[PDB]
Amino acid sequence: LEGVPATLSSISFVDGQRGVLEYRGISIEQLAQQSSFLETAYLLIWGHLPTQQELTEFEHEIRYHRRIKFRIRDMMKCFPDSGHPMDALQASAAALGLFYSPEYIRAAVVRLLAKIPTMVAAFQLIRKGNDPIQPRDELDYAANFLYMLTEREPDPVAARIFDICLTLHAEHTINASTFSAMVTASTLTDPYAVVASAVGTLAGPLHGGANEEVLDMLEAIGSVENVEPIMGFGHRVYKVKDPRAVILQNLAEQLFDIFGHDPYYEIAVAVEKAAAERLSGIYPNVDFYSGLVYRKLGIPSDLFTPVFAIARVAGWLAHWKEQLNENRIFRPTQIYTGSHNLDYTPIADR
Amino acid sequence: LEGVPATLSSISFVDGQRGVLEYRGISIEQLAQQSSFLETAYLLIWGHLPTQQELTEFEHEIRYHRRIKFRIRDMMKCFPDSGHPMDALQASAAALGLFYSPEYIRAAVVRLLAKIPTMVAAFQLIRKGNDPIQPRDELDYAANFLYMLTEREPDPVAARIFDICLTLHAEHTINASTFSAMVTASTLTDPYAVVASAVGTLAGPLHGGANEEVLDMLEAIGSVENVEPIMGFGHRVYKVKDPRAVILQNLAEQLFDIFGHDPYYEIAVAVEKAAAERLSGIYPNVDFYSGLVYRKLGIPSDLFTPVFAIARVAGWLAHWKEQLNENRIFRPTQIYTGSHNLDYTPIADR
Amino acid sequence: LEGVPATLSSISFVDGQRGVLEYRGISIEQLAQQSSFLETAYLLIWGHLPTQQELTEFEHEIRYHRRIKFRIRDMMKCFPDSGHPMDALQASAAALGLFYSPEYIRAAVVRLLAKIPTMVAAFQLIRKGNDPIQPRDELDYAANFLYMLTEREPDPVAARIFDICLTLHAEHTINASTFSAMVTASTLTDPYAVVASAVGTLAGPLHGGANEEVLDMLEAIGSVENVEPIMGFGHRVYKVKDPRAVILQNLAEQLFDIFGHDPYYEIAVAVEKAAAERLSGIYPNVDFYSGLVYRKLGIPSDLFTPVFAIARVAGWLAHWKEQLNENRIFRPTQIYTGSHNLDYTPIADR
Amino acid sequence: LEGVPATLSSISFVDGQRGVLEYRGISIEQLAQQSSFLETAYLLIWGHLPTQQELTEFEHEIRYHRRIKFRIRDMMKCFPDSGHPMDALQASAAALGLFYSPEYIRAAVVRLLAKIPTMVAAFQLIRKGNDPIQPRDELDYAANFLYMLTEREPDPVAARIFDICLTLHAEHTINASTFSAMVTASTLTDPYAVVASAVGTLAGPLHGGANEEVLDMLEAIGSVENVEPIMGFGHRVYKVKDPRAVILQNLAEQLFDIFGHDPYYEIAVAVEKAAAERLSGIYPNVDFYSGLVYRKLGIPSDLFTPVFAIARVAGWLAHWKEQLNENRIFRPTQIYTGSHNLDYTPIADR
Amino acid sequence: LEGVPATLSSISFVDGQRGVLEYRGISIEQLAQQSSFLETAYLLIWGHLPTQQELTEFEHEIRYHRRIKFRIRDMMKCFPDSGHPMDALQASAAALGLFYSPEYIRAAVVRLLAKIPTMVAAFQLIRKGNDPIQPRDELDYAANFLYMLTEREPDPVAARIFDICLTLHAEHTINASTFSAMVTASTLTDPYAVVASAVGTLAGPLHGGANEEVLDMLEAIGSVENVEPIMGFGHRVYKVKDPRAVILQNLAEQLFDIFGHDPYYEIAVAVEKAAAERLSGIYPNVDFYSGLVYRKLGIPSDLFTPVFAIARVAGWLAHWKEQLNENRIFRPTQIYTGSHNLDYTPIADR
Numbered sequence A, B, C, D, E: 001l002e003g004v005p006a007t008l009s010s011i012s013f014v015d016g017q018r019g020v021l022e023y024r025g026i027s028i029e030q031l032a033q034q035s036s037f038l039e040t041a042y043l044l045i046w047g048h049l050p051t052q053q054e055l056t057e058f059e060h061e062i063r064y065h066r067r068i069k070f071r072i073r074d075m076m077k078c079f080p081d082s083g084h085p086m087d088a089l090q091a092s093a094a095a096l097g098l099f100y101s102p103e104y105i106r107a108a109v110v111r112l113l114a115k116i117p118t119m120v121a122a123f124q125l126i127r128k129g130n131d132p133i134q135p136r137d138e139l140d141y142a143a144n145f146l147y148m149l150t151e152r153e154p155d156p157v158a159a160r161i162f163d164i165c166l167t168l169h170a171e172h173t174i175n176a177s178t179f180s181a182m183v184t185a186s187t188l189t190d191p192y193a194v195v196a197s198a199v200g201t202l203a204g205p206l207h208g209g210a211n212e213e214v215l216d217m218l219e220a221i222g223s224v225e226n227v228e229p230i231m232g233f234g235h236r237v238y239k240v241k242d243p244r245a246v247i248l249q250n251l252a253e254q255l256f257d258i259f260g261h262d263p264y265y266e267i268a269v270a271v272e273k274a275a276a277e278r279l280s281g282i283y284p285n286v287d288f289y290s291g292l293v294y295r296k297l298g299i300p301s302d303l304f305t306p307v308f309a310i311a312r313v314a315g316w317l318a319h320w321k322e323q324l325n326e327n328r329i330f331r332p333t334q335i336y337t338g339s340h341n342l343d344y345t346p347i348a349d350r
Helices: A028-034 A037-046 A052-064 A070-077 A085-100 A103-127 A141-150 A156-168 A176-185 A191-203 A213-221 A243-259 A263-278 A286-296 A301-325 B028-034 B037-046 B052-064 B070-077 B085-100 B103-127 B141-150 B156-168 B176-185 B191-203 B213-221 B243-259 B263-278 B286-296 B301-325 C028-034 C037-046 C052-064 C070-077 C085-100 C103-127 C141-150 C156-168 C176-185 C191-203 C213-221 C243-259 C263-278 C286-296 C301-325 D028-034 D037-046 D052-064 D070-077 D085-100 D103-127 D141-150 D156-168 D176-185 D191-203 D213-221 D243-259 D263-278 D286-296 D301-325 E028-034 E037-046 E052-064 E070-077 E085-100 E103-127 E141-150 E156-168 E176-185 E191-203 E213-221 E243-259 E263-278 E286-296 E301-325
Strands: A012-015 A020-023 B005-009 B012-015 B020-023 B333-336 C005-009 C012-015 C020-023 C333-336 D005-009 D012-015 D020-023 D333-336 E005-009 E012-015 E020-023 E333-336
Touching: A020 A028, A020 A037, A020 A243, A028 A156, A028 A243, A037 A052, A037 A103, A037 A141, A037 A156, A037 A301, A052 A103, A070 A085, A070 A103, A085 A103, A085 A191, A085 A301, A103 A141, A103 A191, A103 A301, A141 A156, A156 A243, A156 A286, A156 A301, A176 A191, A176 A301, A191 A301, A213 A263, A213 A286, A243 A286, A263 A286, A286 A301, B020 B028, B020 B037, B020 B243, B028 B156, B028 B243, B037 B052, B037 B103, B037 B141, B037 B156, B037 B301, B052 B103, B070 B085, B070 B103, B085 B103, B085 B191, B085 B301, B085 C085, B085 C191, B103 B141, B103 B191, B103 B301, B141 B156, B156 B243, B156 B286, B156 B301, B176 B191, B176 B301, B176 C176, B176 C191, B191 B301, B191 C085, B191 C176, B191 C191, B213 B263, B213 B286, B243 B286, B263 B286, B286 B301, C020 C028, C020 C037, C020 C243, C028 C156, C028 C243, C037 C052, C037 C103, C037 C141, C037 C156, C037 C301, C052 C103, C070 C085, C070 C103, C085 C103, C085 C191, C085 C301, C103 C141, C103 C191, C103 C301, C141 C156, C156 C243, C156 C286, C156 C301, C176 C191, C176 C301, C191 C301, C213 C263, C213 C286, C243 C286, C263 C286, C286 C301, D020 D028, D020 D037, D020 D243, D028 D156, D028 D243, D037 D052, D037 D103, D037 D141, D037 D156, D037 D301, D052 D103, D070 D085, D070 D103, D085 D103, D085 D191, D085 D301, D085 E085, D085 E191, D103 D141, D103 D191, D103 D301, D141 D156, D156 D243, D156 D286, D156 D301, D176 D191, D176 D301, D176 E176, D176 E191, D191 D301, D191 E085, D191 E176, D191 E191, D213 D263, D213 D286, D243 D286, D263 D286, D286 D301, E020 E028, E020 E037, E020 E243, E028 E156, E028 E243, E037 E052, E037 E103, E037 E141, E037 E156, E037 E301, E052 E103, E070 E085, E070 E103, E085 E103, E085 E191, E085 E301, E103 E141, E103 E191, E103 E301, E141 E156, E156 E243, E156 E286, E156 E301, E176 E191, E176 E301, E191 E301, E213 E263, E213 E286, E243 E286, E263 E286, E286 E301
Parallel strands: B005 C333, B333 C005, D005 E333, D333 E005
Antiparallel strands: A012 A020, B012 B020, C012 C020, D012 D020, E012 E020
């Protein structure tokens, strides 16, 4: 289906031959320097920058809905401990519609945005046999998520780095997950089912992406002298450089300089400086620095993809709201490549 | 059975032709101005005003027993979400006897008084899918109940208004609920069964009283210009004015002036000033101002009757303790108005 | 309140100076010989003998509703194991209104009649740590209750004896429990609250009656030679003989002759033959033979009163239905025997 | 402690230089041919062969107590799915004392014997996410255990083989588990604690014995042509042949001839016929044939040791009952091989 | 088995003819004056006094693991309320192996030491129907245990007295419980099974020791004038005086002088001053003062033995670690005192 202009969207723009990525016409650097995750999500979903009162009301509503019912936690207590976090995320997103399914757009958006990280952290805590940690009203989005994940209040620098990372991964362009979200939404269904379908599509093979395989190769190297004696490089769109990659690398460098270097960072630098001298087109992408940034913040490996989903919910929701107005069922045609006009044969004659 | 002096009680006195209401000989105005709910309950149950040490010990014992066992909360978790609060209150009062049934009078009184509002608030929170809020030892009776109901610490003015309202509704006179309580207590049964029977009697039709129908009429009017273009007025005892009504109206006026006016207050004033000019005998009663006072404090509509029950437990308990000493089973006689000396007819012959 | 004709009822007639007991004008002997419990309950509630089709439909509806929801069983699983069966019965009757509260009279009657013994047996099984036994559609009322209580299908003779015992204890006359039921029902409340109030009244002191104290005296005697070297005799109404007592004694004699004599029966005969020679007025009542009949059927001691309640639900319900049509709140008057016109005294001045 | 005659027991006799094993003086062949597991357990515990009435009463009491409370099953539902069956067995044996701890000896024996296999099968079913299967009164000990384990009623031949295997493994002689059982019982403690201590001792390294390593070697060989191109042979007591081994081999041969040969049996025969020609002293023991017999009956590998424990409970209990009469705390002496008369040193000086 | 030097241990030394008790060669007075419980446990298990960094790391690791999983608390919620604390302790110790069974020695030691008092307090709270109190990171071992037991933060003096008491009862010498622990550990099993076996052995008769019978006699006397008008005196090892008894008496005197005298202390002094004048050899032991010290701290009577177990876990663990290196199964020999060479008799011929 590649190459078919099946959608008319004014949400994001991507130029691979120039390294340009824009959210609603605003470059990603502007949002990565002078914007947060919630304001970027408001810009994506509603199409315009919120005012002061709108931003404060949005943040208050999101902070008020960060707590989940005790029935949802009880449901998570019945999840098997060996299940993957993506399956649990899909199950919880589908279960949100058992409870919460003009003002319908705004309420659903704020509930989903407030509650998705809460359930992710709750399942992370429950899987190891611990009790889920309740959200705190004093903290903000990224800081509260980090506290819920690690039981400890994070440094403001780490919270800012995580917020900018979420903004970078908020949305890129049309893809399999977004296409599935729009296909589900074309039937005028509740956004919780759309989110569940998008998460199921995003799970992919092995319930993970190329964010952990980079760490696997890095551990396989195991030293800064085995890099010289491939996943984590290249891209299918951009040809000069991924514009998110430079910001991610700068954030990783700043966070590691402030919080002290680690050996895996050293092996990453050793491999990347060698790869930039013999393969450069081939350039590193966000899949290389995202793993390092997430691991330095204390995020487990198998929770890399769910965190990505936490960033992507704002994108999906945006594409949902658009689709709505353009109500049109995805009903493509097919060509038959089989046999014709044969008859049923008795079972005894087979 | 109306008109039969079936009880000899020295607890309360009511004079409808003079507008007099007295608790143990003390006028309701004195208690509404210079007394709290717990001291009034002590006066009602024990017949005399407590001293300083007695009052402090009573308050300490009540504050210590405000917490319910986790089995009771687990039982509430199994209650259907569509059940009425009165049925849940009766079930919880009956379940208290599964656990806690000279020193027997005092322990039962303090446990019931401490725990009834706790279970009311716990069911209110559980019904909506939230976790019950634990009581705080720093707050007092009314303030702790309001915090448990609304998750937020109330203003001291609101707590005082609620305490005076509870004192006003603590006890009025013999009625159906009190008669049922005395009938149950005449068999020398535990006070928890008496409280459950009294709550079941108090539930009445539609599991509610005339406190919500006033709000229904007020919403039906919907404006301050539709009052001119009936429940909430009149009484069956008093002919001049309900002495509790004037205090309730003063409290409502003070609370609304301090906390800002509301449109429903405006419609209430518009309807009452018109009704006092063409119907005055017909006068407003406590059922008119109680709904407004409770709604301004954040109390839901369907929890009006349970809150009334919270006020009435002190009265019932008092009537229980009295009845005890006067041990006499309510064994009235009957007259037969049916057929006599007929025989059984075979089923095939019917 | 004794001696006041407060009720006009055509349900039952009692003549103590002639030993006459009639249900709706039909003598108790006719119903005890040629009637069952369900047909007698239909006669009591509806006032006339049911036809064939009506009786079959009533039995089918009762048999269909004998199964309780899993939420009720879960609630019983949270009951403390040391609680008394009467408190659990009251709690379950109150909880039935959380779920099931022209056709309203009939549905409530059949649900209560079908489900009360089911919950009694379920609590009996749960209290000892066993799982409740589900009802069987092949058995009838008494046989199914006995199977649920003892896990074993009873002999048809035992089932018939239990059915006749239930018919005998179905209703006697106005008393404390029935008066409380009518007082609760006068407010036009649901029958589940009426049943809960009646059970609470019937619990009485020590959560039991004089049915177990007879066994206590019999065990204290401990032999057929210690009767010569009082609870279980006399009555407050009848002067010649209790007409239910002769039928109960005949049933006990028949059941014990068919199923073999027991030592406690021998001590009962020894004490009764001595008491009938020196005290005869003083005559044995149903409280003497009911304990023996229930114990021979395998019913535990502390479940004597609940079984009585199972018999009495038909009576209460009947009195409920009558009361309804005669809607009149029990609002008696009182006389004040206390002090007048005293004032509040400061706490520091006490 | 080897070589010290610390116990005087008349329960079992073992002669390794003659291949003699006797239970209370009766050879193991007599019991393996003309006795069952329950009668052998009665002989071991009570010292004499039961009569007809005693045997029937023992079997009836054991069959009546085969059902466990729902609280125990609920406790098993909280066990982690990754836990080993031996830890769960120890936990359940310890939990039995939370409930059931002249007639005390007999009741404890029958409860333990009836309930241990029930909990083993219940944990086996729960661990895989299935519901436990309730026991059937129609089946006997071994057949009911096999039905509970595999949901299917076993062939009578298989049940007989399993019963004879249980009789063979009922008891051998004093060892670590029996010594721990007697040490625990010397303090006059309940038999449930003794059973829990014995199970904990029997768990050993890796929570298993040499019964699964034989299957590991057999699978490693993987063919009947790789035996020629060691666990499962030899013993520390017998020098001619294990008298239980010949019976176990005969039972395995009969069961496999009746139920059809399997490839692992073929590899077992190939390895044993080669080992009996070049190593014969070195002879196979019960650890070789027990695994094959258990696997052919459908018993999982990791449940080999618990089944052994099911056989051994009769032995332990016997040694418990004996110990009782000979009340003497195991209080051995020790010799000090450390430093003397040194003093405490400040932490800052270390 | 008394008198057999079955063990070679350099952990503790006891001299009864001189009143000497040493942990690893260091006298008990030095540790009771200038040491805590955790440092003494480190000395016992590892054989040398920890340094500053080692002590801080040990305390940090113990404080981090003081919290138990929610599955363990759920398992305790299923324990019967009438069960004894020792059975619950054994069940919880066995259940710890369902979850947590070079670095293996240290992790197991810290988990057991951190979690045993937590589960003891959790069962104490659950048994009465209250929720378990979570540990606080600000408090230390004894203070946190006292807070968890009594919901109130203890005075530092009381915490110090409790810590010294735990140090005194940490370990005495080889006995039945330690012998059972070594017998279980000789099979190279996990330390959780060893702890469960040791607890089962320590439960003893009536699930308690002679620490509560002293209080029983003291209450039987009931006055300071009935001592003149035996458990709690004497010992089986020491002949001059128990060296722990003098420290325990000094601690009790100091704690009671600081916190005010109690009548039971007065009766204890009256009985001990009379017993020291007519029986002195006969001297009081730790069983006399331990009950008083524990009761003054708010510890219930039936939890005396579990608290002792909390002290003894360090000893058992030490003996476990030693045993390990000296791997040798306790396989004693026996002498047969029964019949020989008899045959099986048909059941019909018995």
